[PDB]
């Protein structure tokens, strides 16, 4: 395990843990879902948590969240990734730009930095054209 992954696990938790008390409630889950365009019922939020709430205390802590992140995509991800490509590629020209990546991050809550947006583009960019095409994206998401 890299310090890099730890980094990523912290970001991922902090998408849900909006108050940063260190636990994910149904309310925080529901909030994240709604921003993703879904409207889960209260029962559904309970169910999502209770699949992974090892101590049965009705919330999710860091290691229980790690379990969430560790369960595979693993047979229906191709379509989920095709869909994801569409949301990222707003003008649909088949290439994700820095500016389109920035919007996604924002919509996910991040509002810094530009260099880091470029960095993200740079790392996903196999052919060197400065943007992310569908295949480059596929690999950025299966990394």
């Amino acid at each position: 395990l890299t310090e890099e992954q730890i980094a990523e696990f912290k970001e991922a938790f902090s998408l849900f843990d909006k108050d940063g008390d260190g636990t994910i409630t149904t309310k925080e889950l529901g909030t994240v879902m709604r921003s993703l365009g879904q409207n889960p019922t209260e029962a559904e939020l309970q169910d999502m948590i209770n699949e992974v709430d090892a101590d049965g205390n009705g919330t999710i802590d860091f290691p229980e969240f790690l379990t969430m992140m560790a369960r595979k995509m693993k047979t229906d991800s191709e379509e989920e990734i095709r869909e994801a490509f569409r949301v990222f590629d707003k003008d649909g020209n088949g290439y994700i730009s820095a500016a389109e990546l920035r919007h996604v991050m924002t919509n996910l809550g991040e509002k810094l930095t530009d260099e880091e947006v470029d960095e993200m583009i740079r790392e996903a960019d196999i052919d060197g054209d400065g943007q992310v095409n569908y295949e480059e994206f596929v690999q950025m998401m299966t990394a």
């Binding site: 890099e4 990523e8 970001e11 999502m48 991050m105 809550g109 990394a143």
Partner: peptide, 23 residues
């Protein structure tokens, strides 16, 4: 890097979807 929230939104979406299937 900075892929965490992206990974999480992908993860949770499939979770919610896999929730509904499971009951």
């Amino acid at each position: 890097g900075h892929m965490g929230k992206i990974y999480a939104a992908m993860m949770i979406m499939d979770y919610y979807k896999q929730s509904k299937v499971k009951k």
